[PDB]
């Protein structure tokens, strides 16, 4: 009767437990940013009781392996989350239909977006790239990161305009899509190639840092599939920026005006569009701030198991 159903569920739990444990040290198959929240609190046929992964919308998940059509094995990208069971999109959509059927009975779109397995770090500010103050100030930060995270870091130049890398544009198989692109910046093929280059650089869970020439503002990457960590190098006083640009001679100074415009553009950007804001006066202090953030990220994406 019920005692043999319990024997079947007990052994099966043990198989799942074993799969789960074996998957602990496995590489990440892919990453997702979630579009929906999921709570495991109230359900059965979860492969191992208490082991389902609950998550909020906009959380990042690392998927390691397929358990079955309903469940994958992976983890919430968060310092102490261990492996667990994540509901597949099919399950989540079935849960949505069941919720809709319940709703009718009262008689009163993609849950997961694929993302790089490590969020690429992007630097914006204090002003426009291709000018000396911003370029020199970012170079300093890039040199530090190469040192502080040597062995765990990949810093790469991206000249291609990855701002054109809107997710829908890149999924579009149609050979007619090109006739919609008024003057293109760079080529969408090259952009796609470059996006896959970034996904690939992060596949082994090393920190990825992009030196992205075309990105001066977070809104240029928000529609993309990169889910970057956007680090805002902020000079708080415009008077300071003006003087810094003037320190670089008459040529640089001739474009004081555009430079101050971009700076002010970033300055009115909502704080929520950035992941980190480095407004420290001293390189050493900004560097430490950035390292603390990236070290915690490292811990979110690795800690004890591997």
């Amino acid at each position: 009767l019920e005692e043999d159903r319990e024997a079947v569920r007990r052994e099966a739990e043990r198989q799942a437990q074993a799969q789960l444990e074996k998957a602990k040290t496995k590489p990440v198959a892919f990453a997702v940013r979630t579009n929906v929240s999921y709570s495991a609190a109230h359900e059965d046929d979860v492969p191992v009781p208490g082991m389902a992964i609950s998550f909020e919308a906009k959380d990042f998940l690392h998927v390691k392996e397929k358990f079955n059509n309903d469940w994958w094995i992976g983890r919430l990208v968060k310092e102490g989350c261990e492996i667990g069971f994540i509901p597949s999109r099919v399950k989540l959509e079935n849960m949505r239909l069941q919720h809709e059927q319940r709703a009718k009975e009262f008689k009163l779109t993609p849950p997961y977006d694929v993302v790089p397995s490590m969020r690429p770090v992007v630097l914006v500010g204090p002003s426009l790239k291709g000018y000396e103050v911003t370029d020199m100030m970012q170079k300093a930060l890039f040199d530090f990161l190469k040192h502080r995270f040597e062995g765990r870091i990949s810093i790469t130049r991206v000249t291609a305009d990855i701002s054109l890398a809107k997710r829908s544009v890149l999924n579009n198989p149609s050979k007619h899509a090109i006739i919609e692109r008024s003057n293109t910046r760079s080529s969408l093929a090259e952009v796609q190639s470059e996006i896959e280059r970034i996904f690939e650089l992060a596949r082994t869970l090393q920190l990825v840092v992009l030196d992205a020439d075309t990105i001066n503002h977070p809104a240029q990457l928000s529609k993309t599939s990169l889910a970057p960590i956007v680090v805002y190098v902020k000079i708080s006083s415009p008077k300071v920026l003006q003087r810094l640009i003037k320190s670089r001679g008459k040529s640089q100074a001739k474009h004081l005006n555009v430079q101050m415009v971009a700076a002010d553009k970033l300055a009115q950007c909502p704080p929520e569009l950035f992941d980190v804001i480095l407004d420290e006066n001293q390189l050493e202090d900004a560097c430490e701030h950035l390292a603390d953030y990236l070290e915690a990220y490292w811990k979110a994406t690795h800690p004890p198991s591997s």
Binding site: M136, K139, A140, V240, R243, S247, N281, L283, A286
Partner: peptide
């Protein structure tokens, strides 16, 4: 505080040469 900002930011720039 402007002199502080400037001096720190100036040496930061020099580190980016």
């Amino acid at each position: 505080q402007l002199e502080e900002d400037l001096r720190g930011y100036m040496s930061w720039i020099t580190q980016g040469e």
